[PDB]
């Protein structure tokens, strides 16, 4: 890879409540050993065979360690892993036609990072995604989520795809003609957005000033769009901005 940060991507996906589906997912009337075997074979053949075939469809830079049953462990270029996470979610949702959900954790590590710690950390992220519960009123976690590089960046799959990826696409399409001072301006935007929690007024003013400085190579309309996002959807905006910085980092790859 030529553009991005020289980082390995570790993906760990797991179907939510597959054991519950095997216990009581099938209605009691349609319970037989043949139906149970059909469901088991569907799941197993999907994971093993179809993950192989789907990753062979386009030359993803992935190095699948294990697919097996209900689980997944793949290591590759972090951009390819991030791109294939949504493809995996969509293909699983098609295959099950939205009867089972999948949780994933995506870790980002350097090449010489310990493999034991890669596995442990990405498992922790996958557990955090399985801990996803948007409202503290329901019973049992929603579990249909993905964790992005850190246990604080747990987003649902719909949230991830729609919000984060449309924001990342807009940022990419509006930030490609920035200067090398613009990169530092994006860094400052990220720092200000992270600090907004402990600085309500001065920090939003500083963000407005930074957008003012930027709105000469990005346009006034997108500066206003970023300002609106910062006051409405901040954590998604921070996620998209960090992903853009890591994807466009010119420190080899």
């Amino acid at each position: 890879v030529e553009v991005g940060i020289n980082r390995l991507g570790v993906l760990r996906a797991d179907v939510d409540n597959l054991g519950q589906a095997f216990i009581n997912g099938i209605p009691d009337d349609y319970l037989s050993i043949s139906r149970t075997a059909t469901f088991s074979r569907a799941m197993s053949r999907f994971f093993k065979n179809y993950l192989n075939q789907l990753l062979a469809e386009k030359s993803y830079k992935i190095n699948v360690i294990y697919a097996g049953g209900d689980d997944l462990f793949m290591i590759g270029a972090w951009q390819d892993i991030l791109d294939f996470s949504i493809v995996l979610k969509q293909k699983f949702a098609d295959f099950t036609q939205n009867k089972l959900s999948i949780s994933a954790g995506i870790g980002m590590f350097r090449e010489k990072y310990p493999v034991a710690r890669m596995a442990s950390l990405t498992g922790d992220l996958e557990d955090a995604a399985k801990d996803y519960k948007p409202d503290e009123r329901a019973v049992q976690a929603t579990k249909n989520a993905v964790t992005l590089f850190d246990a604080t960046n747990v987003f649902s799959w719909d949230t991830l795809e729609n919000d984060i990826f449309v924001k990342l696409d807009a940022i990419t399409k509006n930030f490609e003609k920035l200067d090398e001072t613009g990169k530092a301006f994006i860094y400052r935007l990220i720092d200000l957005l992270r600090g907004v929690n402990e600085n309500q007024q001065i920090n939003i003013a500083r963000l407005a000033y930074t957008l003012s400085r930027m709105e000469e190579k990005i346009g006034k309309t997108f500066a206003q769009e970023l300002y609106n996002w910062a006051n409405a959807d901040r954590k998604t905006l921070i996620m998209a901005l960090e992903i853009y910085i890591l994807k466009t980092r010119e420190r080899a790859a």
Binding site: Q201, I202, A205, R206, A208, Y209, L211, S212, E215, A223
Partner: peptide
């Protein structure tokens, strides 16, 4: 000073 800085910051990004 914080009020003045915010005043200038909002004066830009809206006017400039």
């Amino acid at each position: 000073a914080r009020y003045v800085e915010s005043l200038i910051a909002y004066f830009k990004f809206y006017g400039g």
